Design a protein around this ligand. Sequence first.
Ligand code: RAM
Length: 321
Amino acid sequence: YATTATYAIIVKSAGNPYNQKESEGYKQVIEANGGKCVIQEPKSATAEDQITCINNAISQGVDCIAIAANDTDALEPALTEAKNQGIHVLSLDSATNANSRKVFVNQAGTTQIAQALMDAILDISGGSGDWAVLSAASTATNQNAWIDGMKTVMQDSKYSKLNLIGVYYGDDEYQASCDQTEAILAADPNIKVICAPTTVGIMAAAKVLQDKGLSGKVKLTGLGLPSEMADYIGDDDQHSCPYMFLWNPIQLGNLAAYASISLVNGTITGAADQSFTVPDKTLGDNGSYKITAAADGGTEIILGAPFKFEPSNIAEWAKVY
Ligand SMILES: C[C@@H]1O[C@@H](O)[C@H](O)[C@H](O)[C@H]1O
């Protein structure tokens, strides 16, 4: 994994601790192995602000770009231009389309996240009732994939007494996510569960439910940082979130860095059925990963399974991320 190349990571947006942990993990591995890492945080979680960052990376003459896409398709011209300049493009966290990358590094199976969330809603609701999604940007590939996944999973007869009222967008912004939580509550006060598959959205919704005194009546699940959600997690009337899920964003960054170095050094090309082993034997199968065909027609590397954070384990993990 020795490298002397320069690697740009472009996260979704500024002002999001999840993205900072991702970029930290990426930088740590790149630098440990001799490369240079340049991190960019788009001003907002939009395609427009990301394109500006892609263009900056190209201008700096970097060797590799790793990107968490704010839109599945809008980045394609800039990323193609990067490729035309000889830059390896990798995607992580939120996928660019298959034509815009050599490989996607996915935190967990898309289906695994959808299934965990649907089963959580079914459990936490008591088996029936109205629920809503508080998403991030309406264009974000990952939330859209999870939401599509949930909608597929929820067709199963076991979920037939649940009713999804709709999808609201908090844009991965605290204030917007608080405002949309209030909008959800106003639209359906009898809602049983809010599912927020965004670390920003879930902690914003938690804050709103706590402030309104609703933790005993409206429950909350989703995808959140243990560090942010620790005080909201509990199985009683005083905590809105009985449990939620995530994965290690630092390790997501780590793996994306190992894969980036592997692309630059030519150890992999992104093609299905290729394998690589990273120094870190806690990832994969004793460090080993295989590239698999992805549903979007590209290829992907899957970091691990989702991890459930609940009262029995939340405090220890809150110090990790
Ligand atoms: C769950 C998590 O939530 C936010 O931090 C971002 O939208 C990120 O892309 C997503 O993976």
